[PDB]
Amino acid sequence: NKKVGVIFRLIQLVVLVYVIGWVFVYEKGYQTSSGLISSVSVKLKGLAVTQLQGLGPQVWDVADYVFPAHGDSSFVVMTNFIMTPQQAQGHCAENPEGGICQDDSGCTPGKAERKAQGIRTGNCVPFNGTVKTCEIFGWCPVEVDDKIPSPALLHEAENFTLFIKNSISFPRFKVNRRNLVEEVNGTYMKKCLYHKILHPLCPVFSLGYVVRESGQDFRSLAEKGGVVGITIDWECDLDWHVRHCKPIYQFHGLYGEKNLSPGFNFRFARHFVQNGTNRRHLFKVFGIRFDILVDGKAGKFDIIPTMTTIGSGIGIFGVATVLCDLLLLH
Amino acid sequence: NKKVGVIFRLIQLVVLVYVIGWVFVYEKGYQTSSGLISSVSVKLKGLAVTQLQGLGPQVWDVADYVFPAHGDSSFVVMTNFIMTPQQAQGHCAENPEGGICQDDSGCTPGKAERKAQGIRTGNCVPFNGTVKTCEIFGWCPVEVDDKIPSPALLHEAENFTLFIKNSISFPRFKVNRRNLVEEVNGTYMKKCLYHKILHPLCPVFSLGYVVRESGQDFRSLAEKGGVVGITIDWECDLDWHVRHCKPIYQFHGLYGEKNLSPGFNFRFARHFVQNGTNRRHLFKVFGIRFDILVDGKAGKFDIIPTMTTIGSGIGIFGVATVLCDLLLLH
Amino acid sequence: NKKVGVIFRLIQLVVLVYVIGWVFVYEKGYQTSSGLISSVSVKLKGLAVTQLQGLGPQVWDVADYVFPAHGDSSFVVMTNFIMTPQQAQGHCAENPEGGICQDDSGCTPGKAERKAQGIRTGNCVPFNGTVKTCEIFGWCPVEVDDKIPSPALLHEAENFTLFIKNSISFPRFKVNRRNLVEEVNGTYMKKCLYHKILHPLCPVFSLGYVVRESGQDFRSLAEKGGVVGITIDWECDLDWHVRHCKPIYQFHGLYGEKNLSPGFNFRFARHFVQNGTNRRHLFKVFGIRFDILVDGKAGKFDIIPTMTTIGSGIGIFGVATVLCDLLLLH
Numbered sequence: 004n005k006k007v008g009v010i011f012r013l014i015q016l017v018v019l020v021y022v023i024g025w026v027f028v029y030e031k032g033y034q035t036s037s038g039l040i041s042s043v044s045v046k047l048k049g050l051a052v053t054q055l056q057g058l059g060p061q062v063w064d065v066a067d068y069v070f071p072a073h074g075d076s077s078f079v080v081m082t083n084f085i086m087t088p089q090q091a092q093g094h095c096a097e098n099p100e101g102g103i104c105q106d107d108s109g110c111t112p113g114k115a116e117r118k119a120q121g122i123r124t125g126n127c128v129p130f131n132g133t134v135k136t137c138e139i140f141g142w143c144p145v146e147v148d149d150k151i152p153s154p155a156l157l158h159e160a161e162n163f164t165l166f167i168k169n170s171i172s173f174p175r176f177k178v179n180r181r182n183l184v185e186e187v188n189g190t191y192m193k194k195c196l197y198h199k200i201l202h203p204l205c206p207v208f209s210l211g212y213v214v215r216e217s218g219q220d221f222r223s224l225a226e227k228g229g230v231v232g233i234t235i236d237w238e239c240d241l242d243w244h245v246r247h248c249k250p251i252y253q254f255h256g257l258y259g260e261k262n263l264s265p266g267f268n269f270r271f272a273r274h275f276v277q278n279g280t281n282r283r284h285l286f287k288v289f290g291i292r293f294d295i296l297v298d299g300k301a302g303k304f305d306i307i308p309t310m311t312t313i314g315s316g317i318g319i320f321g322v323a324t325v326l327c328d329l330l331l332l333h
Numbered sequence: 334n335k336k337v338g339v340i341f342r343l344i345q346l347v348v349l350v351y352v353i354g355w356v357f358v359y360e361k362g363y364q365t366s367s368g369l370i371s372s373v374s375v376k377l378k379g380l381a382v383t384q385l386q387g388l389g390p391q392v393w394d395v396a397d398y399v400f401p402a403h404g405d406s407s408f409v410v411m412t413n414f415i416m417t418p419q420q421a422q423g424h425c426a427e428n429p430e431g432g433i434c435q436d437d438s439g440c441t442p443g444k445a446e447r448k449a450q451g452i453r454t455g456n457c458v459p460f461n462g463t464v465k466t467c468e469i470f471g472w473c474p475v476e477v478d479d480k481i482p483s484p485a486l487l488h489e490a491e492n493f494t495l496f497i498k499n500s501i502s503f504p505r506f507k508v509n510r511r512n513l514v515e516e517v518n519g520t521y522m523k524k525c526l527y528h529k530i531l532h533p534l535c536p537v538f539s540l541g542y543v544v545r546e547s548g549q550d551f552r553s554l555a556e557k558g559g560v561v562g563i564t565i566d567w568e569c570d571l572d573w574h575v576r577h578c579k580p581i582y583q584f585h586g587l588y589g590e591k592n593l594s595p596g597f598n599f600r601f602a603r604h605f606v607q608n609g610t611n612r613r614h615l616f617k618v619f620g621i622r623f624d625i626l627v628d629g630k631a632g633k634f635d636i637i638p639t640m641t642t643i644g645s646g647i648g649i650f651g652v653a654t655v656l657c658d659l660l661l662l663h
Numbered sequence: 664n665k666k667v668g669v670i671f672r673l674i675q676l677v678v679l680v681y682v683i684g685w686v687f688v689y690e691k692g693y694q695t696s697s698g699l700i701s702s703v704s705v706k707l708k709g710l711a712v713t714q715l716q717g718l719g720p721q722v723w724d725v726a727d728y729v730f731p732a733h734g735d736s737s738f739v740v741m742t743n744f745i746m747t748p749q750q751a752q753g754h755c756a757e758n759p760e761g762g763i764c765q766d767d768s769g770c771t772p773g774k775a776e777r778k779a780q781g782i783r784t785g786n787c788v789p790f791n792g793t794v795k796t797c798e799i800f801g802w803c804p805v806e807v808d809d810k811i812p813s814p815a816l817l818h819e820a821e822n823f824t825l826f827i828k829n830s831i832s833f834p835r836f837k838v839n840r841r842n843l844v845e846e847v848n849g850t851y852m853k854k855c856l857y858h859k860i861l862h863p864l865c866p867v868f869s870l871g872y873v874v875r876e877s878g879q880d881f882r883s884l885a886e887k888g889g890v891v892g893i894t895i896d897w898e899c900d901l902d903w904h905v906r907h908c909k910p911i912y913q914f915h916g917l918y919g920e921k922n923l924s925p926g927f928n929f930r931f932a933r934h935f936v937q938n939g940t941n942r943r944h945l946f947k948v949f950g951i952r953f954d955i956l957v958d959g960k961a962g963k964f965d966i967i968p969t970m971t972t973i974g975s976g977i978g979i980f981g982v983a984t985v986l987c988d989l990l991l992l993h
């Protein structure tokens with residue numbers, strides 16, 4: 004029958020167009036992919052002044068709120084902190100959340116099994132006028148974290164300027180690319196701010212813009228802390244010029260339930276010697292966690308992939324025709 | 334032929350059952366796989382007090398033995414240290430491991446090519462009563478690390494509490510998950526220790542338990558340093574509810590030969606100004622290296638993968654039937 | 664026909680040799696692959712003395728130029744720095760690049776929108792004899808980074824010694840390997856330096872050698888900063904003995920445009936209390952960025968992969984015969 008032959012030729016044409024227009028065009032079968040090597044260097048340029056009761060004005064420059072000062076990919080930008088000044092080792096009362104004692108016999112000398120704050124001397128001393136806590140041996144100025152300021156201390160960090168410099172290189176093709184594309188120039192970086200539509204190539208990112216693009220409010224996030232994920236994808240075709248190679252920035256919001264362990268926080272201390280006595284300043288820093296992950300691939304024409312793909316296509320076409328014949332006659 | 338037909342029916346049934354069950358359900362062919370974006374937050378809550386000879390009791394807290402303040406995937410917990418207090422830059426004797434001089438003519442003005450300890454002035458000064466070393470310019474108190482304390486100074490760091498906060502999100506499926514699963518509540522985190530048999534979901538990990546689960550004894554690993562690797566896997570089946578997916582924690586121990594480079598150690602210093610003179614304290618810290626690696630895969634039903642797998646199965650089935658016929662023919 | 668039979672036999676033997684030698688032996692189809700986990704430990708043994716105008720001789724040791732104290736995969740080695748000493752918070756003039764004022768009416772009280780240096784009081788004060796800058800609130804000794812010393816302050820860091828400790832393990836096969844191979848003994852590390860041909864397994868890497876093998880001159884990188892990528896690959900066959908497993912060390916140079924953001928730079932501060940007043944030292948460090956990435960794969964014989972490869976090979980063989988027959992029919 005002529006109709007059977009027409010259907011067979013239609014199936015043959017369909018599979019013959021499919022194999023090429025998919026593997027070669029859509030999937031880039033003739034190209035070869037290699038993993039890149041990336042190093043992320045970040046620089047923060049902004050200032051936030053925090054004034055606390057009983058203390059003088061505090062200046063927080065880049066070195067302050069950026070704790071990974073060595074330009075690590077994963078960095079934390081300080082937005083709120085609790086400061087305990089002039090901590091010195093000695094005999095003093097512990098925190099009330101650790102334990103509450105009504106008499107000296109209640110306290111037991113030794114180390115706490117869980118959440119240890121200090122070596123208990125064995126006496127019950129008044130933490131304040133109302134309650135009494137067991138005396139411990141440690142930094143005497145207590146780190147009270149029960150009161151967290153509702154307005155963020157470093158609330159100016161919302162609309163700061165964040166510079167991200169990423170250099171990627173493909174070892175297979177020996178091609179090195181950087182996020183500073185040829186479209187970006189020196190005068191451009193002076194005033195540009197990153198935008199998904201307006202300024203996609205501008206390497207200067209606003210912290211508030213980055214947080215809002217991830218889906219999180221900066222005000223609520225700055226109080227308790229947060230995690231923001233930044234991904235840079237390098238998808239380019241090496242058959243074209245290297246000018247077309249441009250990085251794509253995607254912001255992902257890493258958050259969780261506020262009822263259980265809200266925000267991100269950590270503690271660091273600055274050790275100094277004053278009046279011949281070793282003292283330190285303890286800060287419970289509530290800051291946003293920024294993680295930068297770079298992944299990408301580059302494709303360039305090669306004979307071996309093209310040949311293998313041609314062979315696979317022939318095999319698919321041959322199998323399809325034989326299978327069609329089995330369907331037609333059985 | 335009847336037997337040929339029976340063999341063909343059997344082969345067809347076998348290959349059909351295979352292509353319908355294995356690749357479809359066992360391999361999750363109908364589902365699509367994607368990656369996740371992860372960020373690890375670690376917190377150490379523990380207290381260790383060391384009483385070095387000739388010094389006062391030293392208290393170590395979270396800011397002390399956790400050298401990464403913000404908290405990275407790779408962090409070191411201090412277990413043993415060698416302290417060289419009050420280092421000042423001047424002309425003084427070097428360490429005997431560098432070289433031993435019997436006369437002043439032996440020393441040469443310059444710097445050593447390998448393992449340089451300072452700028453040699455060309456003079457031979459007695460390091461102690463017995464031997465003499467060439468005078469160098471630098472920190473006069475040399476870190477004498479020939480003697481390592483047999484009992485770990487921070488031996489209490491064995492059964493401390495370690496909390497790991499991991500937030501993973503899949504971009505294509507827009508699903509965000511955290512290690513704090515629905516089963517874990519606020520009261521649960523108050524009193525729980527990670528036990529793979531009893532408490533697999535408890536996010537609080539005991540350091541000694543983590544070290545023992547890696548195949549290493551904590552005492553020798555602490556007195557000399559070591560490396561412990563922790564992996565978190567997120568295998569989720571998005572066809573079910575999100576509560577079904579739970580993180581799986583695996584502890585792998587990274588160890589080497591004790592004869593060559595035993596354990597892990599590093600050098601850090603704290604700079605201070607006392608009596609108008611710049612001084613520092615040098616610590617040779619022997620600590621366990623903890624690395625957190627998070628990798629996961631999620632699969633959800635989709636029409637395109639299902640269709641491709643069905644088509645592939647038909648092709649495999651078709652090839653198998655043709656092959657069976659050829660085998661029967663010959 | 665005889666020639667048709669010869670062509671058929673030739674195609675048969677060709678596809679047989681292919682399926683038996685390429686996908687089985689050359690590609691190790693019978694083996695199975697599993698990813699490894701790695702933790703990198705780095706240690707620098709070098710000393711550089713920098714003499715600056717006004718300040719005394721400054722001695723820099725391992726703890727100094729290596730800012731990551733514990734030691735991560737990404738670390739910075741200080742090669743050049745700009746030191747601003749005795750920074751104290753107060754009302755004082757800003758940098759000329761931030762803004763130049765000719766009258767007090769020009770300055771406006773507030774903070775700069777971009778690249779803020781301090782809180783402008785609103786009075787134009789002379790920065791020096793010629794120009795005047797608006798008075799700001801912050802660290803009064805301003806970092807004047809316009810003048811970069813042409814000779815690197817730390818140029819001796821070229822031919823220093825760098826030791827990399829990498830411990831890898833495969834969880835599937837429970838085999839742990841370290842970069843210290845059995846050929847590397849204790850006496851070997853004392854007198855070996857890494858080379859591509861001479862000492863491929865020596866774990867001591869010269870910084871200048873690493874920089875030069877990446878295609879970069881050490882002086883240009885020491886002047887304005889640099890980024891160097893190190894990759895350690897673990898390609899071994901677990902069918903052989905573990906002694907054959909040897910890591911491969913190669914260095915990748917992440918080049919950057921000289922006119923736009925040359926090199927890598929960062930800023931850190933050391934806080935100290937002197938004479939009861941809080942002061943700090945600000946350093947703008949132009950240090951080379953060293954990134955270490957480990958990617959390895961191990962293969963061991965298994966029955967399931969061997970069977971699948973045999974089956975796939977038979978399928979390819981069958982398809983080829985059918986295709987050949989179709990061509991003969993045509």
Ligand SMILES: Nc1ncnc2c1ncn2[C@@H]1O[C@H](COP(=O)(O)OP(=O)(O)OP(=O)(O)O)[C@@H](O)[C@H]1O
Nearest residue numbers: 046047048164165166192207778808923924925928
């Ligand atoms: N966080 C940032 N916000 C805005 N601009 C930045 C930021 N980081 C860098 N830049 C600009 O990018 C250009 C190149 O930066 P580079 O790494 O050379 O720093 P630099 O110019 O050496 O240091 P500085 O900016 O302190 O002079 C500089 O002109 C700088 O003004």
Ligand SMILES: Nc1ncnc2c1ncn2[C@@H]1O[C@H](COP(=O)(O)OP(=O)(O)OP(=O)(O)O)[C@@H](O)[C@H]1O
Nearest residue numbers: 118148263264265268376377378494495496522537
């Ligand atoms: N390493 C740890 N060991 C034991 N419990 C921990 C640890 N880290 C956090 N937790 C507990 O988990 C709960 C939620 O964690 P969260 O991030 O709120 O800590 P936190 O309350 O800020 O720390 P802290 O209890 O020191 O004030 C807290 O009540 C805390 O006590």
Ligand SMILES: Nc1ncnc2c1ncn2[C@@H]1O[C@H](COP(=O)(O)OP(=O)(O)OP(=O)(O)O)[C@@H](O)[C@H]1O
Nearest residue numbers: 448478593594595598706707708824825826852867
């Ligand atoms: N960066 C380096 N350059 C040259 N040799 C090194 C380097 N790091 C380590 N070594 C050598 O490797 C040997 C073993 O190092 P290991 O990790 O045991 O340090 P250590 O001997 O405990 O401490 P240190 O080497 O600081 O005295 C040492 O004898 C040392 O000489």
Ligand SMILES: *[C@@H]1O[C@H](CO)[C@@H](O)[C@H](O)[C@H]1NC(C)=O
Nearest residue numbers: 099100130131132133134149
């Ligand atoms: C004393 O401290 C406890 C701690 O919980 C607090 O509840 C109480 O109000 C304090 N009393 C005074 C008088 O400050």
Ligand SMILES: *[C@@H]1O[C@H](CO)[C@@H](O)[C@H](O)[C@H]1NC(C)=O
Nearest residue numbers: 158159160161162163211776
């Ligand atoms: C937002 O950016 C503007 C820049 O025009 C700045 O004036 C403002 O202070 C920023 N907001 C916060 C909360 O810092």
Ligand SMILES: *[C@@H]1O[C@H](CO)[C@@H](O)[C@H](O)[C@H]1NC(C)=O
Nearest residue numbers: 185186187188189190191192
């Ligand atoms: C600077 O870069 C921008 C990119 O948006 C471009 O439009 C502009 O022409 C560039 N300036 C010069 C002087 O080339």
Ligand SMILES: *[C@@H]1O[C@H](CO)[C@@H](O)[C@H](O)[C@H]1NC(C)=O
Nearest residue numbers: 429430460461462463464479
């Ligand atoms: C002097 O130092 C050397 C260094 O190895 C040591 O061997 C020797 O015992 C020391 N002598 C005394 C008396 O401490």
Ligand SMILES: *[C@@H]1O[C@H](CO)[C@@H](O)[C@H](O)[C@H]1NC(C)=O
Nearest residue numbers: 116488489490491492493541
């Ligand atoms: C082990 O844990 C127990 C908790 O009951 C604690 O008392 C003990 O001190 C721990 N061991 C060490 C060596 O710290």
Ligand SMILES: *[C@@H]1O[C@H](CO)[C@@H](O)[C@H](O)[C@H]1NC(C)=O
Nearest residue numbers: 516517518519520521522534
């Ligand atoms: C707390 O979590 C545990 C998980 O093991 C659960 O058994 C317990 O019921 C939870 N407590 C409450 C009050 O829900």
Ligand SMILES: *[C@@H]1O[C@H](CO)[C@@H](O)[C@H](O)[C@H]1NC(C)=O
Nearest residue numbers: 759760790791792793794809
């Ligand atoms: C004052 O500082 C400016 C800053 O650009 C500089 O150009 C000028 O030469 C300086 N004048 C003197 C006398 O140092």
Ligand SMILES: *[C@@H]1O[C@H](CO)[C@@H](O)[C@H](O)[C@H]1NC(C)=O
Nearest residue numbers: 446818819820821822823871
């Ligand atoms: C290069 O290495 C040699 C070792 O013989 C050393 O003397 C020299 O100072 C090194 N060069 C630099 C610039 O440090």
Ligand SMILES: *[C@@H]1O[C@H](CO)[C@@H](O)[C@H](O)[C@H]1NC(C)=O
Nearest residue numbers: 845846847848849850851852
């Ligand atoms: C030390 O290692 C080297 C590796 O190059 C080897 O040639 C030498 O024989 C080893 N020394 C001893 C004493 O085994």
Ligand SMILES: [Ca+2]
Nearest residue numbers: 070071401731
């Ligand atoms: Ca650090």
Ligand SMILES: [Ca+2]
Nearest residue numbers: 077405406407
């Ligand atoms: Ca890291």
Ligand SMILES: [Ca+2]
Nearest residue numbers: 319322648649
């Ligand atoms: Ca096929």
Ligand SMILES: [Ca+2]
Nearest residue numbers: 276606935936
């Ligand atoms: Ca001080």
